Each structure stands twice: as C-alpha cells, then as structure tokens.
Amino acid sequence: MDYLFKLLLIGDSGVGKTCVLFRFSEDAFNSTFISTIGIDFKIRTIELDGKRIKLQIWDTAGQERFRTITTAYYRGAMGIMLVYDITNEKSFDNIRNWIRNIEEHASADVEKMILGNKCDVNDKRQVSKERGEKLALDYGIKFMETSAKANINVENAFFTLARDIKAKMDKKHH
Numbered sequence: 559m560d561y562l563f564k565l566l567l568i569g570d571s572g573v574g575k576t577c578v579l580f581r582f583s584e585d586a587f588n589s590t591f592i593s594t595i596g597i598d599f600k601i602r603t604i605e606l607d608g609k610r611i612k613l614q615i616w617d618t619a620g621q622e623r624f625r626t627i628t629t630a631y632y633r634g635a636m637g638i639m640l641v642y643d644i645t646n647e648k649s650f651d652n653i654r655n656w657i658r659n660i661e662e663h664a665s666a667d668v669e670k671m672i673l674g675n676k677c678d679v680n681d682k683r684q685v686s687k688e689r690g691e692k693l694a695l696d697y698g699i700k701f702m703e704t705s706a707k708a709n710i711n712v713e714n715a716f717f718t719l720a721r722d723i724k725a726k727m728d729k730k731h732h
C-alpha cells in the first residue's frame with residue numbers, strides 16, 4: 559500500500575450500509591459463504607494513478623455501543639458515506655441529523671458523499687433522484703444512487719470518494 563484511507567459508513571438501520579460494504583469488498587449480496595454479523599470493517603485495495611490505496615471501510619453506525627456518537631468515533635476518518643434508502647423517506651430526512659453529527663463531533667476535516675441506496679427498487683421509490691441531488695448540493699457534498707443488490711455505482715462511489723481524498727492529500731503535499 560502507498561495510501562491507507564479510513565472510510566466510515568453512517569446512516570439509519572435498514573438502508574443497506576452492510577450490504578454496500580460486502581458488495582464492494584466481497585462482491586456478495588446476502589450470500590451464505592459470508593457472515594455479515596459483527597463485522598466492524600472490511601478492507602479492499604484499489605489502484606488510483608498507479609498507486610495501491612488500501613480502503614479500511616467501517617460499518618459500526620448501527621450497533622448499540624455507538625448509539626451515543628462522540629468525537630472519538632470520527633478520529634482518523636478521511637471519508638464518510640452517508641447512506642439513505644430511496645424507498646424510505648424517513649432515512650433521507652435523517653441524513654441532515656447525521657451531517658450535523660459529523661459537523662459537531664468530527665475533529666478533523668473529512669470528504670463526504672451521500673448514497674441513495676436500493677435504486678433497483680423503482681416501484682417503491684419515496685425519494686426522487688432530484689431531491690437527493692438538491693440535499694447533497696445544499697451541503698456541498700457529492701451524490702450517487704447505488705444498489706448493493708444489482709451492483710449499481712458501488713465501485714463508482716468508493717473510487718470517486720477515494721479520488722477526492724487522494725486529490726486533497728496530494729495537493730496539501732505538492
């Protein structure tokens with residue numbers, strides 16, 4: 559590895575944070591060959607500008623011990639994926655509360671991206687792509703609609719976030 563990026567997945571329970579992680583890291587969706595129970599992080603190494611970037615992606619937003627989130631939770635975090643479910647408007651409304659939680663407790667500056675997950679389920683869509691784009695735009699954050707199930711824009715999301723982290727990091731130094 560040339561770079562090591564600590565990414566966090568945050569968002570309401572049931573939006574598909576764990577499925578996004580295991581789709582990206584294992585190319586699996588609710589498979590029997592994996593256990594997604596009590597997995598705090600997954601590692602995937604990608605290539606940007608010919609360099610090996612090791613992504614340590616954390617999925618700890620759901621579990622009890624971090625239902626009260628403190629400054630300690632976001633320590634070392636270089637990227638955050640804010641995940642909502644396009645079929646659940648309540649999960650989308652709570653993205654503002656998750657952003658406030660980052661703005662208040664994150665000590666260091668961090669690259670952020672909003673994922674509208676479950677974009678394969680169009681018939682149940684409660685949040686238009688336009689409303690997701692307008693929210694992300696209001697906060698100066700990047701936006702994608704993903705599907706952990708259909709494998710839509712999962713690689714694209716993590717490669718785009720990693721690119722934005724690397725670009726910031728490379729500019730600081732040269």
Ligand SMILES: Nc1nc2c(ncn2[C@@H]2O[C@H](COP(=O)(O)OP(=O)(O)O)[C@@H](O)[C@H]2O)c(=O)[nH]1
Pocket residue numbers: 569570571572573574575576577578588620675676677678679704705706707708
């Ligand atoms: N249709 C569809 N279902 C999904 C997708 N991602 C996750 N799910 C389902 O949504 C539920 C919640 O997923 P999970 O990863 O446990 O959400 P988490 O609580 O944020 O970790 C599960 O039953 C998944 O099968 C997706 O992209 N499309």
Ligand SMILES: [Mg+2]
Pocket residue numbers: 575576617620
């Ligand atoms: Mg989960």
